[PDB]
A = this chain, B = another copy of it.
């Protein structure tokens, strides 16, 4: 009955190789995926910084706006 068990094992093995290959492909996908989120993160901090800067500038401009407006 060893022949049947060897044919079954070889079948299951063909299946394992299939799955592991598809798997490795997905893992490559994951490395570029990590790089990508790190970028989005970077972009977000860059943008918050810009927003914060514009907010200070804006508040300055607005102050002068109030004082000059009621002054003249």
Contact = CB atoms under 8 A, between A and B. Distances in A.
Interface of A: 2, 5-6, 9-10, 12-13, 16, 19-20, 23, 26-27, 29-30, 33-34, 36-37, 40-41, 43-44, 47-48, 50-51, 54-55, 57-58, 61-62, 64-65, 68-69, 72
Contacts of A72: 68, 72
> Which secondary structure characterizes the binding site on chain A?
helix
A29 B5 CA distance: 35
A44 B62 CA distance: 26
Contact of A30 (B33, B54, B57, B61): B33
Given A16-B20, A40-B40, A68-B68, 4 more contacts: A13-B16, A23-B23, A26-B27, A37-B40
